[PDB]
Write a protein that binds this ligand. Sequence first.
Ligand SMILES: Cc1cnc(Nc2ccc(N3CCN(C)CC3)c(F)c2)nc1Nc1cccc(NS(=O)(=O)C(C)(C)C)c1
Length: 127
Amino acid sequence: SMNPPPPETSNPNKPKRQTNQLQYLLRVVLKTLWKHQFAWPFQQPVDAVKLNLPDYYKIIKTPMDMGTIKKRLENNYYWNAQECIQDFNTMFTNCYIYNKPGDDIVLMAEALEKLFLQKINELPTEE
Ligand SMILES: Cc1cnc(Nc2ccc(N3CCN(C)CC3)c(F)c2)nc1Nc1cccc(NS(=O)(=O)C(C)(C)C)c1
């Protein structure tokens, strides 16, 4: 089962703006998570062909990954921090939906999510 096209990272029809919270999401949240030892499965779209997971995109219909999020942030795709936080949450939820408790990938997601939430807990006051 073939890979779908990746999620968009630009869209001229979508409104957007720069906010101090979005800057933090790139400079602090994304850039820190990227360096975590367990980041790598989440740095690009899942390659379900290479992994021989032909049902991955049968089950995950709203895929999301940190490579996509990074590009969206660099490309000023978002209107607000909540939109970006939603993409991270989609990424984590997708992992917990597809995999079994106790799977290595779930342990990895959980560690990354712990760090994410620590960073979001310090999200600066808006504007
Ligand atoms: C984000 C995520 C969510 N859920 C999974 N699940 C999952 C399930 C089963 C297996 N394996 C596959 C091989 N097979 C023999 C045994 C079962 C499995 F490997 C993973 N995996 C995720 N990410 C990931 C993990 C590893 C490797 C890459 N590599 S990649 O090519 O996609 C890359 C380098 C482009 C990120 C991604």
